[PDB]
């Protein structure tokens, strides 16, 4: 459950948030596979309720109406085509599994759903599954509102409705089996694992009961006896009732402390300095590396009021974002997930974005195709951060140094830091308001290395900055604080 099941040597997954299956299929072939990405976290592939007030928000996909593979991202055959095509070029698919609940209690009964299935939320009826009222926790929840009132009572956090989301009776074998049937259909198709949505809202043991029913991965792509990769979404920033450690027996857990702390550090807020990252990881009170799924931002908190609030860095703060993602991709702690987003018109009111509901780029509700420009950027409002040279090459960096230990740390007691990964990679950052000018021990074999942040190695040449590592491993680094990207990275495969 903890092994990513990505091909050996591939160390990151990318969240292609709201992307269509036909677009992801092609993206695997034209980019993700060749660029060494481990896999793609796709948006919920199961049918959801259509929300019109507001108009087709991204969050309508977290309100299931059935387990049919039919959404704005595409149909079941397109989903299959995507999983097959991606696995064939070595890129896995990880499904965002929304299994804690069905849709909102107030959704109207009818066929206002992504595949036309009928449902009657008012009376908890989902005939397309099928589920009935007795398949929900209404009779188990003791709160007057029927929702979670105290997030300190483990019972209501798990048994009541997460803000009106109809809460499935996960203790019932019928429910457990219906969910497992869905997950197994996906595993058999070729999916490598799952993001378990709203894990905090399910009992660790009910999740275990569902996971235990799952098939081994498809042997057309995985060795026999391979278990699906599981990463559970649990937000725990410390000092709260429910701890992420309660879920370690099921698989990895999202470490939300990661981006919150890194964002605060890179923004140089509240006295934090990059030099304090020397003991990044468990030293900062984070969960064990082998249980962590890390990321700088996720689809929810990149909107500003999620775990970490305004400290979270996103594509909107590109320069700083690249430094945070670069540090994450270079550091050995956790399994890394990179975000890929779409743009929207923000509307801040006293610091809060009220347009955070806006869904993916669309034409009258139909999601727009991801167009690729000659310079590798994307059109139609897709940001495609995963295609930014600075991120793309750091994803490769992580692959190259995979398995190598944290080494050769250096810092200027302020915001200039550097470190390496065994004898295979080295990275230097300047997040101070003045020039970085130092000769540092890289731990790398002597020679000329192409800096992969400013350029690439092509044949026997570099397109950007070159770093000369002397025979004893030391090299001179000069980074202006006015540099577009104030960091340099070199590795065993960027050496000339």
């Amino acid at each position, epitope marked *: 459950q903890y092994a990513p099941q990505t091909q050996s040597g591939r160390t990151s997954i990318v969240h292609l948030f709201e992307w269509r299956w036909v677009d992801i299929a092609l993206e695997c072939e034209r980019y993700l596979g060749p660029k060494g990405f481990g896999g793609v976290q796709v948006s919920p592939p199961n049918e959801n309720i259509v*929300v*019109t*007030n*507001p108009s087709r*928000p991204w*969050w309508e996909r977290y*309100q299931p109406v059935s387990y049919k593979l039919c959404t704005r991202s595409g149909n079941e055959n397109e989903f299959r085509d995507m999983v097959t095509r991606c696995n064939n070029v070595g890129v896995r698919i990880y499904v965002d599994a929304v299994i804690n609940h069905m*849709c*909102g*209690s*107030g*959704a*109207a009964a009818g066929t206002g759903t992504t595949c036309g299935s009928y449902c009657n939320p008012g009376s908890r009826e989902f005939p397309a599954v099928p589920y009935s009222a007795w398949d929900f926790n209404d009779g188990k929840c003791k709160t*007057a*509102s*029927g*929702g*979670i*009132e*105290s*997030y300190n009572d483990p019972y209501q956090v798990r048994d009541c*409705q*997460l*803000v*009106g*989301l109809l809460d499935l009776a996960l203790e019932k074998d019928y429910v457990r089996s219906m969910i497992a049937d869905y997950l197994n259909k996906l595993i058999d198709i070729g999916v490598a694992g799952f993001r378990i949505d709203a894990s905090k809202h399910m009992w660790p043991g009910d999740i275990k009961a569902v996971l235990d029913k799952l098939h081994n991965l498809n042997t057309n792509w995985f060795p026999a006896g391979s278990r699906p990769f599981i990463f559970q979404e649990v937000i725990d920033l410390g000092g709260e009732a429910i701890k992420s450690s309660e879920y370690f027996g099921n698989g990895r857990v999202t470490e939300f402390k990661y981006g919150a702390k890194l964002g605060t550090v890179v923004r140089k807020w509240s006295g934090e300095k990059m030099s304090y990252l020397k003991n990044w990881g468990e030293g900062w009170g984070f969960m064990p590396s082998d249980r962590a799924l890390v990321f700088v931002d996720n689809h929810d908190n990149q909107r500003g*009021h999620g775990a970490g609030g305004s400290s979270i860095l996103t594509f909107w703060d590109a320069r700083l974002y690249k430094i945070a993602v670069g540090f994450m991709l270079a550091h050995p702690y956790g399994f890394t997930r990179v975000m890929s987003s779409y743009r929207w018109a923000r*509307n801040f*009111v*006293n*610091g*809060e974005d*009220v*347009n*955070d*509901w806006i869904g993916p780029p669309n034409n009258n509700g139909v999601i727009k195709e991801v167009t690729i420009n000659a310079d590798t950027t994307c059109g139609n409002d897709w940001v495609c951060e995963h295609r930014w040279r600075e991120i793309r090459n750091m994803v490769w960096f992580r692959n190259v140094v995979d398995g190598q230990p944290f080494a050769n740390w250096w810092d200027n007691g302020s915001n200039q830091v550097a470190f390496g990964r065994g004898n295979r990679g080295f990275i230097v950052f300047n997040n101070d308001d003045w020039q970085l000018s130092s000769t540092l021990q890289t731990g790398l074999p002597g020679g000329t290395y192409c800096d992969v942040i400013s350029g690439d190695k092509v044949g026997n040449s570099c397109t950007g900055i070159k770093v000369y590592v002397s025979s004893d491993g030391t090299a001179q680094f000069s980074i202006s604080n006015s540099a577009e990207d104030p960091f340099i990275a070199i590795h065993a495969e960027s050496k000339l």
Partner: nanobody
Amino acid sequence: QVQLVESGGGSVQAGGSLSLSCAASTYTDTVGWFRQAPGKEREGVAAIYRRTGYTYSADSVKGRFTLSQDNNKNTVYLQMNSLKPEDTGIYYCATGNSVRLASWEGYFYWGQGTQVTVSS
């Protein structure tokens, strides 16, 4: 960029009813009603999470007050039944984005309020 228009309220006899309305210029996840009674601090009355229709009501008015949202517009309605003198006060609509409705936190914009006075 957000404006709120509060309607309803006014004078009514004890045991009577009133229906308040809060029309927002844009969508927000949480909308709550608060009131400030004569010489007392502001108090949460009811709140609704707009992604689902889920509502939370203060013990002081549950069963008597019902908050709902329009199916098409960015407007919420507070049906106030069985009113009593203790309900007199200025009622304010507020927009927020908290998922912890019982905490009354996360509000970022407040309306001008509407007077509610319960006689007898």
